[PDB]
Design a protein around this ligand. Structure first.
Ligand SMILES: *[C@@H]1O[C@H](CO)[C@@H](O)[C@H](O)[C@H]1NC(C)=O
Lengths: 47, 36
């Protein structure tokens, strides 16, 4: 499902949890915060 | 074909997208489809 372009949710506001197209990976602000908060090791890249 | 999982040899790469049939890794799947 895709959210409509116009965010007319009767005053309720969800920008901080909806995807942000600016980021190369379409993650929300809180998702980016969570991803940065974890210092993951051994990601498993090609190397 | 080069993928994040490694080198895949013997499978043709296409830009279409379908349901996963044989999961390879890193978002790549392989399947038997069409001359097959
Ligand atoms: C498949 O991927 C994209 C689809 O738009 C385009 O470059 C072209 O149709 C195809 N390119 C290759 C390398 O298969």
């Amino acid at each position: 499902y895709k959210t409509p372009p116009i965010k007319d949710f009767g005053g309720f506001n969800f920008s901080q949890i909806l995807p942000d197209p600016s980021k190369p990976s379409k993650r929300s602000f809180i998702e980016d915060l969570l991803f940065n908060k974890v210092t993951l090791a051994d990601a498993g890249f090609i190397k | 074909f080069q993928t994040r999982a490694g080198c895949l040899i013997g499978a043709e790469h296409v830009n279409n997208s379908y349901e996963c049939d044989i999961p390879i890794g890193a978002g790549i799947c392989a399947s038997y489809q069409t001359s097959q």
